[PDB]
Design a protein around this ligand. Sequence first.
Ligand SMILES: Cc1cc2nc3c(=O)[nH]c(=O)nc-3n(C[C@H](O)[C@H](O)[C@H](O)COP(=O)(O)O)c2cc1C
Ligand SMILES: Cc1cc2nc3c(=O)[nH]c(=O)nc-3n(C[C@H](O)[C@H](O)[C@H](O)COP(=O)(O)O)c2cc1C
Lengths: 182, 191
Amino acid sequence: DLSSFGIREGISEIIASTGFEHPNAAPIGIVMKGERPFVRLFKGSHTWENVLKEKCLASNVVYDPILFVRSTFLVPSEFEYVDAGEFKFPVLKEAIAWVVFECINLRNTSLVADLVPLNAGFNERNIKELPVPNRGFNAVLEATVHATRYQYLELIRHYESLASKCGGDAEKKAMKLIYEAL
Amino acid sequence: DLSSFGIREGISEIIASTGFEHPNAAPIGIVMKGERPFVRLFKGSHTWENVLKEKCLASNVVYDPILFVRSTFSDLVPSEFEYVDGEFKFPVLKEAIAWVVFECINLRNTDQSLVADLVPLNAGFNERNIKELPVPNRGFNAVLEATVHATRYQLTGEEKYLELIRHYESLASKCGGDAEKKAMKLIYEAL
Ligand SMILES: Cc1cc2nc3c(=O)[nH]c(=O)nc-3n(C[C@H](O)[C@H](O)[C@H](O)COP(=O)(O)O)c2cc1C
Ligand SMILES: Cc1cc2nc3c(=O)[nH]c(=O)nc-3n(C[C@H](O)[C@H](O)[C@H](O)COP(=O)(O)O)c2cc1C
């Protein structure tokens, strides 16, 4: 039941892990519009390269804005390996919940692929506080989108003030990290 | 532990319930920056009037964008609330994920706002209301922003705001589910 692992109606903003041979993480929206979940991957990214080669991707639900930003620009010790068929596949140690997916029906449009769930897990250890809407966290999320597009600088500058007004220390540090990264 | 009930560092966007004698709900940001949480209420609102008289307010954590927009632009009906416990009961939302009843203290005017610190009196969790895992969704986030800009459009009349609402409608349509798309329709109807 994908809903329990954060894969929900609309576009769920998660951190996608890929790379059996070298783990990689990057924010990705998984889309759910009534049928199988699917992804639309910008061509050229390591996520795109990994899905083409390996046809596997895992979702990682993350509420930490620092992790979102660091993954927009993670080292192997940050990943753990979980069962994906007879292979093991990297997910984030700090994931609240993960689902490993086989990527199917690959088609260029970006690269689009539908997702078939292989295995899923929940990390009780990782939920310490109750999630609550925070416009500062939302602002960091909008900044990472523009950062990725930039890879826009003017736009990132605006979100900074919302992150500073509404964010906690973690949102403020994440926004600092974006500024440093570019 | 307030973080267990959704009162976290920074400004937590919740729906505040107030009104011993007639329950009222409205989106409000509770601010936490190292000490007691506090609220900055715009003068003249129903939440403001109830805090002034009663000095009590409850946070309600809500992930439903429909309830956000309805509480912003409408009156929730008394059947949407339930009563929880010092002496006297106090209204919280039945659809709240988690609620905290606070005594409002140190009421002070600054600017065109009433500021109050918050001392928790009681708190609860509604297991029954968590059915899916929360996940960041830019459509939900767009609904939140659109509600802010819509209130400013009512302020100020500026077209700058209708243009922003249209951009957020676009994200709600792309990224949201059915609930977000319904929420945006309610914003439009309200305007
Ligand atoms: C919140 C957010 C959502 C994103 N969603 C997608 C997406 O669904 N598809 C995509 O290709 N890129 C998406 N991106 C952009 C990628 O995260 C970005 O290009 C990333 O840095 C690629 O890194 P990689 O080469 O390691 O895969 C998103 C970025 C942000 C911050
Ligand atoms: C996301 C969001 C956050 C808000 N935060 C506050 C706030 O913290 N303080 C405040 O006075 N009004 C805030 N508002 C505006 C009130 O929600 C709005 O004026 C509401 O209509 C008040 O209704 P009431 O008269 O029933 O109190 C916020 C609105 C939105 C949509």
